């Protein structure tokens, strides 16, 4: 079995070489360069609308591409579609199993995908000839529970399941086309790139990975966290991404230089992070902590610049719209709130 | 108001949507929901097959008894980490727990020096002392008893428990096992553990579950009115 320990030492020496080459290309921290700019004073954001009607915890919320309609998922088995401007509801799609943990909105506004604990992704059609909403597709090829799913296109969808794997499917044929493996823990969050050619996924053991959908292999890996990964979001530019965690610490990684840049940690927070989202210009990094309120962490200064404390329970989802006009937050108190 | 013609028709649709949401919300809120837990071969299949049944991943079993609708969630096919998806079961009435008495001289697979009974005890300790299930009662079942007696009369109980002074017969041994299982409860002033020995007839098991659920409902109603 000398081949085994030989390969172990080979892998360890390769990792040491990678670490030394990674740290060698670093000359100055990002905080040192961004020391001659004026930070934002105070981001005072007040609530505008209060979307009510849910009767259980809220686990998923997504914005449409038209910045007007949103989709929400809850434990009572409903998939209500909200109109953000007039607070009216547009659909009340029911679900087969009332155990859901993710939801998505198609970029064309035709279909809506939803996962859950039954390791099955259901895709509903909203533009049928009749007046109801039918189940267009039902993808079932995962063993572990689904945690997140994103519409790469109107015909392709990429999901990240609980059995340490991700899958890129084809809706019309019903079978998966590509399978991304390599994580040793439960993949519980992924994010697609703005150009929708690469994506990132954070495992359950202090690790994130960058995959390409064409070749289907891992290009780079990022580490530095201690507890685990809980939420990831790309930078609007597409060359960096912010990664949350549970040990009251979020970080910013770069894709071109596979090394950590900044970390946004405070000694007054000992609670985990559930959702991480950027701004329209990539200057305000909204983070949702499970201590009954959110934060408006600055991106380039790592200094808190606002608190959206208008919530009653743990915030489970938050999302900025496409044009950056407002942000939506959904917590476990069955109340969505719009901030502008 | 200042709304247009077809804008007021959209507000009428939202009202009917909210009405249908509220009507369905008061129908699924008057039925009891309960979780089911246990080891691999703790007779969970035997329990779900024995009790009344009308109905990969989570499996839900719906039945009725004495004008009460019981839903039973069997999270047995979830091989993922239990820490991540457990907070989804925070709101639940009871947690059925299946334990096998005859599974105490049967050593685990893929190992030879760790006992299955101690594994079940550790799992019960992990479940009862969770930060989410700090207010929900626990119903505990001892499934196999005839095999347990036949094994304890041929093989002493000292194999699993190293400190035991009683005789090697079923009666005091069952009480000793029950006392050892009930002592693994740190929150001894907020939740109660209802222990039962599973029999061959359906009626006794269903009646015990119904009585436990009724007691939990009465306690919750007394806690609601600030009267207890």
């Amino acid at each position, epitope marked *: 079995g000398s081949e085994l320990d030989q390969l172990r030492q080979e892998a360890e020496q390769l990792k040491n070489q990678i670490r030394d080459a990674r740290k060698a290309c670093a000359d100055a921290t990002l905080s040192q360069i961004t020391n001659n700019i004026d930070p934002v004073g105070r981001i005072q954001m007040r609530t505008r609308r209060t979307l009510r009607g849910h009767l259980a915890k809220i686990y998923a919320m997504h914005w449409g591409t038209d910045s*007007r*309609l949103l989709v929400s998922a809850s434990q009572d088995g409903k998939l209500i579609i909200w*109109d953000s401007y007039t607070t*009216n509801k*547009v659909h009340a799609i029911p679900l087969r199993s009332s155990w859901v943990m993710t939801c998505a909105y198609a970029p064309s506004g035709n279909y809506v995908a939803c996962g859950g604990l039954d390791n099955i992704c259901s895709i509903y059609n909203l533009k049928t*000839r*009749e*007046g*109801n909403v039918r189940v267009s597709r039902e993808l079932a090829g995962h063993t572990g529970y689904l945690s997140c799913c994103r519409f790469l296109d109107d015909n392709q969808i990429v999901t990240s399941s609980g059995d340490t794997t991700c899958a890129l499917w084809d809706i019309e044929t019903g079978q998966q086309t590509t399978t991304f493996t390599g994580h040793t823990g439960d993949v519980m969050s992924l994010s697609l790139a703005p150009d929708t050619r690469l994506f990132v996924s954070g495992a359950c053991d202090a690790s994130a990975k960058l995959w390409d959908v064409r070749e289907g292999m891992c290009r780079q890996t990022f580490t530095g966290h201690e507890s685990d990964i809980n939420a990831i979001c790309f930078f609007p530019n597409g060359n960096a991404f912010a990664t949350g965690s549970d040990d009251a610490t979020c970080r910013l990684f770069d894709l071109r230089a596979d090394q950590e840049l900044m970390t946004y940690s405070h000694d007054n927070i000992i609670c985990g992070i559930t959702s991480v989202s950027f701004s329209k210009s990539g200057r305000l990094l909204l983070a949702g902590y499970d201590d009954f309120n959110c934060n408006v962490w600055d991106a380039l200064k790592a200094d808190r610049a606002g608190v959206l404390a208008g919530h009653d329970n743990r915030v489970s989802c938050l999302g900025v719209t496409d044009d950056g006009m407002a942000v939506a937050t959904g917590s476990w108190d069955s109340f969505l709130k719009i901030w502008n | 108001c*200042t709304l*247009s*013609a*077809e*804008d007021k*028709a*959209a507000v*009428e*649709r939202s009202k*009917m949507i909210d009405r249908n949401l509220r009507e369905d919300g008061e129908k699924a809120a008057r039925e009891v929901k309960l979780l089911l837990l246990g080891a691999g071969e703790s007779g969970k299949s035997t329990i779900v097959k024995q009790m009344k049944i009308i109905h990969t991943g989570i499996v839900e079993t719906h039945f009725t008894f004495k004008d009460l609708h019981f839903k039973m969630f069997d999270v047995g096919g979830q091989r993922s980490e239990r820490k991540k998806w457990i907070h989804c079961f925070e709101g639940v009435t009871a947690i059925i727990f299946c334990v096998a008495l005859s599974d105490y001289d049967l050593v685990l697979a893929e190992d030879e020096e760790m006992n299955r009974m101690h594994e079940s005890m550790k799992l019960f300790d992990s479940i009862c002392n969770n930060k989410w299930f700090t207010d929900t009662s626990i119903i505990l079942f001892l499934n196999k008893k005839d095999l347990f007696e036949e094994k304890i009369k041929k093989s002493p109980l000292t194999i699993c428990y190293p400190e035991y002074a009683g005789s090697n017969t079923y009666e005091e041994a069952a009480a000793y096992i029950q006392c050892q299982f009930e002592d693994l409860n740190k929150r001894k002033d907020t939740k109660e553990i209802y222990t039962h020995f599973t029999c061959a007839t359906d009626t006794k098991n269903v009646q015990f579950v119904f009585d436990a659920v009724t007691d939990v409902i009465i306690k919750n109603n007394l806690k609601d009115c600030g009267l207890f």
Partner: single-chain antibody
Framework: VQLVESGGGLVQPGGSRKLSCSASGFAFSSFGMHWVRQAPEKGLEWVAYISSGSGTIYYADTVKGRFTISRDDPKNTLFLQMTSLRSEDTAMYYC??????????????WGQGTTLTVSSSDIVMTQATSSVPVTPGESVSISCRSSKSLLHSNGNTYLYWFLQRPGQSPQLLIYRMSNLASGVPDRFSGSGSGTAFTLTISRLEAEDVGVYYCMQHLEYPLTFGAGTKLEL
């Protein structure tokens, strides 16, 4: 999707029968219904409307308090009851479905209609020309003028266009002001300013010829136009 109507024939004044329309192919319980009259060799006009769930009902002031509308969801039927009819009610009747939500297209499926023969302020929409001779292969522009600004504070107008071929019921072309309906080819286009609107066709075929109607939906007293005949 199918809507078939019945209950028409020869009726003397003083009393009349009931018109029954049955639907099959969609969710009838979530669709509002409209009744549309169509006088012979004349223009078509609105009659009555009932909302989803029979919550809100509207009648035309010409037959206000004289006609009655009703639904039946268990059998998905619609009934129109007329107490007494004059000699001016002999016309064709259509039962149209429409659902109202953000992004919907009302007046999508008209139906077939039934005839009825009897033996013997509001916005004014005016069509530009009654009839236009056009040979195939020519871009044609039809204009419809209104008596008030249909543009609302929200940002969208409420002027719909319908095309009626000889021998069958009309169909929707472009809902609201310019968005194209489903199933209609991309040759049709629409535009406007707020008072006078236009509909343009790039190339005209032998299958696209008939009468064009413009309708306003700003207020519940809906009204149509006189009609622009398109000839070969």
């Amino acid at each position: 999707v199918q809507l078939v109507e019945s209950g028409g024939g020869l009726v003397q004044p003083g009393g009349s029968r009931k018109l029954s329309c049955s639907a099959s192919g969609f969710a009838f319980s979530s669709f509002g219904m409209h009744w549309v009259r169509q006088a012979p060799e004349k223009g078509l006009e609105w009659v009555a409307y009932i909302s989803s769930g029979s919550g809100t009902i509207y009648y035309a002031d010409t037959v206000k308090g004289r006609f009655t509308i009703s639904r039946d969801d268990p059998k998905n039927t619609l009934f129109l009851q007329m107490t007494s009819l004059r000699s001016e009610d002999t016309a064709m009747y259509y039962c149209v479905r429409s659902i109202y939500y953000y992004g919907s297209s009302p007046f999508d499926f008209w139906g077939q209609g039934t005839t009825l023969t009897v033996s013997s302020s509001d916005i004014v929409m005016t069509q530009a020309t009654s009839s236009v001779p056009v040979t195939p292969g020519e871009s044609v522009s039809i204009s419809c003028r209104s008596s008030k600004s249909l543009l609302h504070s929200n940002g969208n107008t409420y002027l719909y266009w319908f095309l009626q071929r000889p021998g069958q019921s009309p169909q929707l072309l472009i809902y609201r002001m310019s968005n194209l309906a489903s199933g209609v080819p991309d040759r049709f286009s629409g535009s406007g300013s707020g008072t006078a609107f236009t509909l343009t066709i790039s190339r005209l075929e032998a299958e696209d010829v008939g009468v064009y109607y413009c309708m306003q939906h700003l207020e519940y007293p809906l009204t149509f136009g006189a009609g622009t005949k398109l000839e070969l």
